[PDB]
Structure 1
């Protein structure tokens, strides 16, 4: 199986370029795409080595960097221009998909705030229509700005089969424990999460060896497909498992979890893992849905020898609905302040359905 990544807009290319820089170093691959001398599965992302990337002004900064050997602001303008080059950009993907052994997914790195907002919404509709069996995971990044923010939200709630990273929680963590006061400094933090998000697809493990294994575990219902991240070390597994549940680390600005996935990338002791989960159940640090039986999953991994204990948390929290109301509320305030303008309210209508879908998920009778 393979995964082809797509990078749209200025935000996509940079956080994508920093994603490949971190991964090329994790493996024994020199910046000129030559293996250095100095067991890790590298066929999923690299093609025998060349990354399976599709980049879409900022391109010149990449071509002048030492990594050259490795390859408007209205949402309507972004959607329109994609319609004009439909066959052009779909000719580099078709060969990228066909030439692949057995395609599995389409990782998308973009921010919903201008062209990547529109051109991103356009490709998301074409992708599902062209292939219905291909997963589309999108590493969206949250910030006329309120309009374009919810328009893509309409497309992300029916097209994308699965991770939010909001800049507000990025700015707060930056000033708190990193002392930045800068785009080039926050990108070092997001790329650390991305390279850690797929740490179970670059190393042959016991379970979660496929992209559909990470997705179907968390997402119970195709509407509730928004996840958040947690990454503590910026020692036993109990210390890491407790620090991840602190809201000071969750990258999100009643309420309960639906399913949690913990990633431990260290050399920790494999028998004490059940002991930590036991004390979590006693102290009751996390609450879950009352309707369906939900559990917490923890998986170990092995760090690359060429490139200490870390930990990442992937969870499906109902509190993510709060972020949508902020985008939703700001829209109505702009709708009273200023061909048919009917595409917006349809988007406004469908996003409200998800919000009510979330608030009804935390009830003991969410079914029907």
Structure 2
């Protein structure tokens, strides 16, 4: 009854949405044909799929999501893949001539042409929702569509729907390895717009998952398919309360309430534990203390920032499976006496705990192992200002010589907001310092 509408824009959103929407079909037992198997005569009482899957008079279940891009290179593989019959013929929206890692093409010239077609499809998807929790967004900072088309999509979404929640899963640029050359220009501009047009921005980058798949799953040569599944496992643990039952459930407003202290600070960090291979789970004991001790180590962080430099503000623990509320309190009490983990003075009680009874379901033939209990931590930390520091160091070091500016001026975007978007996060960097001051 409580329903979510997911938006996937860019090439990152579609490829994450290929592996994320595989898990929902494989968790509720929904076949790629769109129908549940007929061997369920004994089974019943299941209507938890209505958050994402809409029924039909023929028994067909179709997802409640929109896939947006400006090229047909990535969506035509979905349209000719295994899940061609499952998605709607119109919920996969294609453009022409992409955006070529340029913010002005994504926002002012090409991203203006198809914004009216997408806004009709969101409204056509919003009338069926008898109750809608909010929106979930998957995109990339370093792209043209993922940063250009997103920047005006959040502006049009807030006008139509007033105070509805907007939560993001963004692909932050990694500190050392990356792909695009002009990624500081696109990363600066799209997050200048979305400070006031968003509510919570979970981030994850690409280097820190390369580190995870090496020393935990013993995969020497991963691809994006190996990385997309781990991001797809975080989304399920976040949303598992709306689907399945539990001792303590969290709505999309509950953990939004307990993670933002001020309106300008809405940047958590995403972590997941336990992650392990199939063979090594067969011997190691997985206690409730050992899966929450792994989340606090800096080596298991999925964003390349060390939390020892900063101080935590608020945390959210989301448990699954055979979790007793007794062991949650004892494992948290150990962390409260740790000196290595530091907290700010004005949040004496920083932990929010949610429990769901469904153990984590793992795709067949996958690299990650089948486990009974797992935890996902959405931790807010001051040490993300280190991530903004290295990128704004990169920006003015390239903006000084006016490199690549004519790709932005000659498309329709004025040069006047190159300075303003840098001046916006100059004051945002002043805000992260004042929050961390102890009273």
Structure with the higher helix share, 1 or 2: 1
How far 1:331 moved relative to its partner?
0.6
Q: 1:305 to 1:160 in 2, by over 3 A?
A: closer
Aligned counterpart, 2:103: 75
Q: 1:359 to 1:274 in 2, by over 3 A?
A: same
Pairs aligned (count): 365
Q: Does 1:100 align with 2:129?
A: yes
Determine if contact 2:139/2:169 at 8 Å carries over to the other structure: yes
Aligned counterpart, 2:384: 320
Q: Does 1:296 align with 2:351?
A: yes
Aligned counterpart, 1:174: 213
Aligned counterpart, 1:126: 156
Aligned counterpart, 2:79: 63
How far 1:197 moved relative to its partner?
2.0
How far 1:154 moved relative to its partner?
0.8
How far 1:352 moved relative to its partner?
1.9
CA RMSD of aligned residues (A): 1.9
Q: 2: CA distance between counterparts of 1:167 and 1:152?
A: 19
Alignment of 1:9-158 (within 5 A): 9-36=10-37, 37=39, 39=46, 41-48=48-55, 49-56=61-68, 57-71=73-87, 72-73=99-100, 74-80=102-108, 81-113=110-142, 114-143=144-173, 144-158=182-196
Q: 2: CA distance between counterparts of 1:45 and 1:68?
A: 17
Q: 2: CA distance between counterparts of 1:120 and 1:84?
A: 14
Deviations 1:60-115 (A, max 9, x none): 11011111121122110011222222322211111111232122211111011122
Give TM-score, length-normalised by structure 2: 0.79
How far 1:181 moved relative to its partner?
6.3
Q: 1:59 to 1:292 in 2, by over 3 A?
A: same
Q: 1:110 to 1:306 in 2, by over 3 A?
A: closer
Segments ≥4 residues shifted beyond 4 Å: 304-307
Q: Does 1:332 align with 2:374?
A: no
Give TM-score, length-normalised by structure 1: 0.93
Q: 2: CA distance between counterparts of 1:148 and 1:218?
A: 27
Deviations 1:300-331 (A, max 9, x none): 22226986322211111111111111221111
Instruction: Between 94-103 and 292-301, report the one with greater CA deviation.
Output: 292-301
Aligned counterpart, 2:299: 248
Q: 1: CA distance between counterparts of 2:198 and 2:146?
A: 15
Determine if contact 1:232/1:244 at 8 Å carries over to the other structure: yes
Determine if contact 1:256/1:287 at 8 Å carries over to the other structure: yes
Aligned counterpart, 1:202: 243
How far 1:58 moved relative to its partner?
0.8
Aligned counterpart, 2:5: 4
Q: Which runs of 5+ in 2 are unaligned?
A: 41-45, 56-60, 88-98, 174-181, 276-285, 363-370, 404-408
Aligned counterpart, 1:277: 332
How far 1:296 moved relative to its partner?
1.4
Q: 1:83 to 1:132 in 2, by over 3 A?
A: same
Alignment of 1:261-276 (within 5 A): 261-276=316-331
Q: 2: CA distance between counterparts of 1:146 and 1:332?
A: 9
Deviations 1:152-181 (A, max 9, x none): 111221111110011121222233333226
How far 1:54 moved relative to its partner?
0.7
Secondary structure of 2:316's aligned partner: strand
